[PDB]
Design a protein around this ligand. Structure first.
Ligand SMILES: Nc1nc2c(ncn2[C@@H]2O[C@H](COP(=O)(O)OP(=O)(O)O)[C@@H](O)[C@H]2O)c(=O)[nH]1
Ligand SMILES: [Mg+2]
Length: 168
């Protein structure tokens, strides 16, 4: 019916911004906290058309049940951190663990956002690449602000899907 992608990460890393750049083409400098939003986009699925549903989650820890349900229903996951915050990278570890616990063949992308702020970088790409290796997932850096690697993010994620032929 649909192909479901969920986006996780700490508050302020750019989850909403990556999703909005991809789906709507827009960017805002203002921070607007999210509870849980979803967006649909028409994509190709096998020799037919379906929707991609993207779930933009919260970085609040106050909704653990909601977060577990979002993991359960997702087909593919994007784990976002900010290259300017080592703490935001560390905060993805428990999320990765919950995906493994609940899912027990799953596209997963580790994404270092805000790569336009390389001068204030705290997480070197080499370190995030090492983590992605241990997690056996893909890695890339993005900038929602610059529209750097935003289309590529979703293209690469759907290309990792081998249980279904999904593309943009
Ligand atoms: N410099 C820069 N700022 C960004 C980027 N992506 C998001 N932001 C900003 O970071 C703040 C949090 O973005 P938001 O999308 O709401 O993050 P979320 O809390 O993870 O959903 C906002 O002020 C955005 O303008 C980016 O790629 N570069
Ligand atoms: Mg948000």
């Amino acid at each position: 019916n649909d192909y479901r992608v969920a986006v996780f990460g700490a508050g302020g890393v750019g989850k909403s911004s990556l999703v909005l750049r991809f789906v709507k083409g827009t960017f805002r400098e203002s921070y607007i906290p999210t509870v849980e939003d979803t967006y649909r986009q028409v994509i190709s699925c096998d020799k037919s058309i379906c929707t991609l549903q993207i779930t933009d989650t919260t970085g609040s820890h106050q909704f653990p049940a909601m977060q577990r349900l979002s993991i359960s229903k997702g087909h593919a996951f994007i784990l976002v951190y900010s290259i300017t915050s080592r703490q935001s990278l560390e905060e993805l570890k428990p999320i990765y663990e919950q995906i493994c616990e609940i899912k027990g063949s799953i596209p997963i992308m580790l994404v270092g956002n805000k790569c336009d702020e390389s001068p204030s970088r705290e997480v070197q790409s080499s370190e995030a690449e090492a983590l992605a290796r241990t997690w056996k997932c893909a890695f890339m850096e993005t900038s929602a602000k610059l529209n750097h690697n935003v289309k590529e993010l979703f293209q690469e994620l759907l290309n990792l899907e081998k249980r279904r032929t999904v593309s943009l």
